[PDB]
Motif scaffolding. Structure first.
Motif, PDB file in Angstrom:
ATOM      1  N   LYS A  63     -12.569  19.661   9.025  1.00 22.43           N
ATOM      2  CA  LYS A  63     -12.964  18.286   8.755  1.00 22.43           C
ATOM      3  C   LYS A  63     -12.550  18.000   7.234  1.00 22.43           C
ATOM      4  CE  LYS A  63     -15.988  17.383  12.600  1.00 22.43           C
ATOM      5  NZ  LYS A  63     -16.598  18.926  13.022  1.00 22.43           N
ATOM      6  N   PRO A  64     -12.202  16.630   7.045  1.00 26.08           N
ATOM      7  CA  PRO A  64     -11.737  16.402   5.690  1.00 26.08           C
ATOM      8  C   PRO A  64     -12.604  16.406   4.512  1.00 26.08           C
ATOM      9  CG  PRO A  64     -11.935  14.212   6.894  1.00 26.08           C
ATOM     10  CD  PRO A  64     -12.226  15.613   7.747  1.00 26.08           C
ATOM     11  N   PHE A  65     -12.063  16.892   3.405  1.00 28.62           N
ATOM     12  CA  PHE A  65     -12.556  17.322   1.952  1.00 28.62           C
ATOM     13  C   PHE A  65     -12.432  15.996   1.327  1.00 28.62           C
ATOM     14  CE2 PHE A  65      -8.716  19.788   1.422  1.00 28.62           C
ATOM     15  CZ  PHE A  65      -8.124  19.156   0.455  1.00 28.62           C
ATOM     16  N   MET A  66     -11.512  15.224   1.672  1.00 31.01           N
ATOM     17  CA  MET A  66     -11.334  13.820   0.879  1.00 31.01           C
ATOM     18  C   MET A  66     -10.451  12.905   1.967  1.00 31.01           C
ATOM     19  SD  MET A  66      -9.102  13.638  -2.700  1.00 31.01           S
ATOM     20  CE  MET A  66     -10.047  14.836  -3.413  1.00 31.01           C
ATOM     21  N   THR A  67     -10.960  11.597   1.820  1.00 30.37           N
ATOM     22  CA  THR A  67     -10.285  10.707   2.688  1.00 30.37           C
ATOM     23  C   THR A  67      -9.427   9.636   1.890  1.00 30.37           C
ATOM     24  OG1 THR A  67     -12.412   9.439   2.747  1.00 30.37           O
ATOM     25  CG2 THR A  67     -12.225  10.862   4.433  1.00 30.37           C
ATOM     26  N   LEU A  68      -8.732   9.017   2.268  1.00 29.50           N
ATOM     27  CA  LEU A  68      -7.768   8.266   1.620  1.00 29.50           C
ATOM     28  C   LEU A  68      -7.074   7.000   2.270  1.00 29.50           C
ATOM     29  CD1 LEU A  68      -4.789  10.124   0.783  1.00 29.50           C
ATOM     30  CD2 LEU A  68      -6.564  11.330   1.743  1.00 29.50           C
ATOM     31  N   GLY A  69      -6.206   6.286   2.017  1.00 27.25           N
ATOM     32  CA  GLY A  69      -5.677   5.341   2.509  1.00 27.25           C
ATOM     33  C   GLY A  69      -4.608   4.774   1.518  1.00 27.25           C
ATOM     34  N   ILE A  70      -3.449   4.109   2.115  1.00 26.25           N
ATOM     35  CA  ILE A  70      -2.464   3.479   1.390  1.00 26.25           C
ATOM     36  C   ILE A  70      -3.195   2.154   0.587  1.00 26.25           C
ATOM     37  CG2 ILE A  70      -0.382   1.948   1.374  1.00 26.25           C
ATOM     38  CD1 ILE A  70       0.295   3.666   4.071  1.00 26.25           C
ATOM     39  N   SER A  71      -2.952   1.939  -0.736  1.00 22.77           N
ATOM     40  CA  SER A  71      -3.428   0.919  -1.417  1.00 22.77           C
ATOM     41  C   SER A  71      -2.329   0.410  -2.257  1.00 22.77           C
ATOM     42  CB  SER A  71      -4.606   1.133  -2.250  1.00 22.77           C
ATOM     43  OG  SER A  71      -5.233  -0.080  -2.348  1.00 22.77           O
ATOM     44  N   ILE A  72      -2.770  -0.541  -3.113  1.00 25.94           N
ATOM     45  CA  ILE A  72      -1.794  -1.261  -4.146  1.00 25.94           C
ATOM     46  C   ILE A  72      -1.960  -0.874  -5.517  1.00 25.94           C
ATOM     47  CG2 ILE A  72      -0.805  -3.570  -4.634  1.00 25.94           C
ATOM     48  CD1 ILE A  72      -1.757  -4.523  -2.025  1.00 25.94           C
ATOM     49  N   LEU A  73      -0.977  -0.694  -6.330  1.00 24.43           N
ATOM     50  CA  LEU A  73      -1.193  -0.444  -7.749  1.00 24.43           C
ATOM     51  C   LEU A  73      -0.252  -1.425  -8.518  1.00 24.43           C
ATOM     52  CD1 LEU A  73      -1.464   1.340 -10.120  1.00 24.43           C
ATOM     53  CD2 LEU A  73       0.696   2.568  -9.794  1.00 24.43           C
ATOM     54  N   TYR A  74      -1.119  -2.378  -9.354  1.00 22.69           N
ATOM     55  CA  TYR A  74      -0.527  -3.489  -9.955  1.00 22.69           C
ATOM     56  C   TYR A  74      -1.273  -3.586 -11.256  1.00 22.69           C
ATOM     57  CZ  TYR A  74       1.433  -8.415 -10.125  1.00 22.69           C
ATOM     58  OH  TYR A  74       1.965  -9.435 -10.470  1.00 22.69           O
ATOM     59  N   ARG A  75      -0.839  -4.696 -12.027  1.00 21.33           N
ATOM     60  CA  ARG A  75      -1.518  -5.175 -13.213  1.00 21.33           C
ATOM     61  C   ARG A  75      -2.871  -5.881 -13.296  1.00 21.33           C
ATOM     62  NH1 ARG A  75       1.612  -4.602 -11.836  1.00 21.33           N
ATOM     63  NH2 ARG A  75       3.462  -5.598 -12.015  1.00 21.33           N
ATOM     64  N   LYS A  76      -3.766  -5.648 -14.177  1.00 21.21           N
ATOM     65  CA  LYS A  76      -4.824  -6.386 -14.008  1.00 21.21           C
ATOM     66  C   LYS A  76      -4.667  -7.787 -14.714  1.00 21.21           C
ATOM     67  CE  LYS A  76      -8.031  -2.737 -15.882  1.00 21.21           C
ATOM     68  NZ  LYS A  76      -6.889  -1.665 -16.098  1.00 21.21           N
ATOM     69  N   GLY A  77      -5.779  -8.646 -14.327  1.00 18.68           N
ATOM     70  CA  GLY A  77      -5.546 -10.194 -14.792  1.00 18.68           C
ATOM     71  C   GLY A  77      -5.037 -11.067 -14.027  1.00 18.68           C
ATOM     72  N   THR A  78      -4.276 -10.720 -12.702  1.00 14.95           N
ATOM     73  CA  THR A  78      -3.526 -11.469 -11.849  1.00 14.95           C
ATOM     74  C   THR A  78      -4.426 -11.797 -10.696  1.00 14.95           C
ATOM     75  OG1 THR A  78      -2.658  -9.903 -10.492  1.00 14.95           O
ATOM     76  CG2 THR A  78      -1.456 -10.268 -12.398  1.00 14.95           C
ATOM     77  N   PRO A  79      -4.400 -13.189 -10.218  1.00 14.16           N
ATOM     78  CA  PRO A  79      -4.902 -13.592  -9.002  1.00 14.16           C
ATOM     79  C   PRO A  79      -4.660 -12.759  -7.719  1.00 14.16           C
ATOM     80  CG  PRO A  79      -3.123 -14.938  -9.480  1.00 14.16           C
ATOM     81  CD  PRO A  79      -3.249 -14.083 -10.672  1.00 14.16           C
ATOM     82  N   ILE A  80      -4.205 -11.803  -7.724  1.00 15.20           N
ATOM     83  CA  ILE A  80      -3.753 -10.929  -6.647  1.00 15.20           C
ATOM     84  C   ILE A  80      -4.608 -10.092  -6.181  1.00 15.20           C
ATOM     85  CG2 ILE A  80      -2.064  -9.363  -5.827  1.00 15.20           C
ATOM     86  CD1 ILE A  80      -0.824 -11.959  -6.235  1.00 15.20           C
ATOM     87  N   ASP A  81      -5.270 -10.161  -4.942  1.00  9.18           N
ATOM     88  CA  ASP A  81      -6.430  -9.677  -4.470  1.00  9.18           C
ATOM     89  C   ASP A  81      -6.111  -8.489  -3.185  1.00  9.18           C
ATOM     90  OD1 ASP A  81      -9.073  -8.837  -5.074  1.00  9.18           O
ATOM     91  OD2 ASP A  81      -9.667 -10.043  -3.422  1.00  9.18           O
ATOM     92  N   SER A  82      -4.858  -8.585  -2.624  1.00 12.97           N
ATOM     93  CA  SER A  82      -4.712  -7.771  -1.312  1.00 12.97           C
ATOM     94  C   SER A  82      -3.420  -7.875  -1.071  1.00 12.97           C
ATOM     95  CB  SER A  82      -5.603  -8.524  -0.476  1.00 12.97           C
ATOM     96  OG  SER A  82      -5.396  -9.849   0.100  1.00 12.97           O
ATOM     97  N   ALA A  83      -3.077  -7.232   0.133  1.00  8.97           N
ATOM     98  CA  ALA A  83      -1.710  -7.013   0.791  1.00  8.97           C
ATOM     99  C   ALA A  83      -1.269  -8.336   1.203  1.00  8.97           C
ATOM    100  CB  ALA A  83      -1.620  -6.065   1.701  1.00  8.97           C
ATOM    101  N   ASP A  84      -2.214  -9.149   1.818  1.00  6.45           N
ATOM    102  CA  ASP A  84      -1.872 -10.661   2.118  1.00  6.45           C
ATOM    103  C   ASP A  84      -1.131 -11.477   1.199  1.00  6.45           C
ATOM    104  OD1 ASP A  84      -4.087 -11.541   5.120  1.00  6.45           O
ATOM    105  OD2 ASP A  84      -2.956  -9.752   4.717  1.00  6.45           O
ATOM    106  N   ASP A  85      -1.877 -11.396  -0.097  1.00  3.24           N
ATOM    107  CA  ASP A  85      -1.316 -12.024  -1.103  1.00  3.24           C
ATOM    108  C   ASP A  85       0.053 -11.464  -1.440  1.00  3.24           C
ATOM    109  OD1 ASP A  85      -3.825 -13.262  -1.184  1.00  3.24           O
ATOM    110  OD2 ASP A  85      -4.549 -12.096  -3.125  1.00  3.24           O
ATOM    111  N   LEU A  86       0.319 -10.497  -1.285  1.00  4.26           N
ATOM    112  CA  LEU A  86       1.894 -10.053  -1.470  1.00  4.26           C
ATOM    113  C   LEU A  86       2.655 -10.581  -0.503  1.00  4.26           C
ATOM    114  CD1 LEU A  86       1.304  -6.365  -2.966  1.00  4.26           C
ATOM    115  CD2 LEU A  86       1.559  -8.297  -4.224  1.00  4.26           C
ATOM    116  N   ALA A  87       2.515 -10.215   0.772  1.00  2.51           N
ATOM    117  CA  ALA A  87       3.372 -10.507   1.940  1.00  2.51           C
ATOM    118  C   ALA A  87       3.892 -12.146   1.936  1.00  2.51           C
ATOM    119  CB  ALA A  87       2.532 -10.180   3.197  1.00  2.51           C
TER     120      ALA A  87
END
Ligand SMILES: Cc1cn(C[C@H](N)C(=O)O)c(=O)n(Cc2ccsc2C(=O)O)c1=O
Ligand SMILES: [Cl-]
Length: 251
Positions: free
Chosen positions: A100-124
């Motif tokens: 069984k897993p010793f670490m769980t993870l998932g794809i996410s987003i790497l970007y700068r701080k301070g921008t109104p961007i808050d999700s994949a929907d915002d990017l798409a």
């Protein structure tokens, strides 16, 4: 039985120690996976010998169904365990077993701080901010094979703007985020590692998919369930949390 453990160089999971002291065998390495293996070895009571996978690959299947990497070492009985950031997947479970897993993870987003961007929907729904992934990596594949509305849109964008949106490697993608208006879709574990070391960068949104890293064994290995047990003990006792903090935390 001294168990042969296949693994792969990958920061901060497995690295050569920065030392010219007389270190031999397992003592030549350090990292999250070495700490995990030491704990497993203490709970189960096994001796082990770490061997880097000769071809330096995780494990994929060719057109003929022939495997390579750590997976091939297990199939061939050249290794008893694979302890590495090795994802538990349907295709791999056909040929090897996993704890069984010793670490769980998932794809996410790497970007700068301070921008109104808050999700994949915002990017798409926009094109001012370029976004993509490492070319031909697990993240690109996810987007390419996805049937989820928003991820199909993000893929269409990444693929049509292919030459520019898809980068050569994590290092480059990180560079792209630091120097241009770009967001990199990468595995959450890697993002956490980078954000701890670069205060200008941040993770955007939650996890896009879900998967876990497990210890691989040959099919039928009597160590698999014992390793799951040990993993659960370490999690519950907060040890996996401490081992993660040890390697991920930055300045
Ligand atoms: C530590 C680690 C292992 N692996 C190998 C993967 N877990 C495997 O089991 O094949 C990986 O694909 N990524 C993600 C990755 C590497 C190059 S591109 C990419 C991605 O997320 O697209 C990692 O960050
Ligand atoms: Cl299981």
């Amino acid at each position: 039985r001294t168990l042969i453990v296949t693994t792969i160089l990958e920061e901060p999971y497995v690295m050569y120690r920065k030392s010219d002291k007389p270190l031999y065998g397992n003592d030549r390495f350090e990292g999250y996976c070495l700490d995990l293996l030491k704990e497993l070895s203490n709970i189960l009571g096994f001796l082990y010998d770490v061997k880097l996978v000769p071809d330096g690959k995780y494990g994929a299947q060719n057109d003929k169904g022939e495997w390579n990497g750590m997976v091939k070492e297990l199939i061939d009985h050249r290794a008893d365990l694979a302890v590495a950031p090795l994802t538990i997947t349907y295709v791999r479970e056909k040929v090897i077993d996993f704890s069984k897993p010793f670490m769980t993870l998932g794809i996410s987003i790497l970007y700068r701080k301070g921008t109104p961007i808050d999700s994949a929907d915002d990017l798409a729904k926009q094109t001012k901010i370029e976004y993509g992934a490492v070319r031909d990596g697990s993240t690109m594949t996810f987007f390419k094979k996805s049937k989820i509305s928003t991820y199909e849109k993000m893929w269409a964008f990444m693929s049509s703007r292919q030459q520019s949106a898809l980068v050569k490697n994590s290092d480059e993608g990180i560079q792209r985020v630091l120097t241009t208006d770009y967001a990199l879709l990468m595995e959450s574990t890697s993002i956490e590692y980078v954000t701890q070391r670069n205060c200008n960068l941040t993770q955007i949104g939650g996890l896009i998919d879900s998967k876990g890293y497990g210890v691989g064994t040959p099919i039928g290995s009597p160590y698999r369930d014992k390793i799951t047990i040990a993993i659960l003990q370490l999690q519950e006792e907060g040890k996996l949390h401490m081992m993660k903090e040890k390697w991920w935390r930055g300045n």
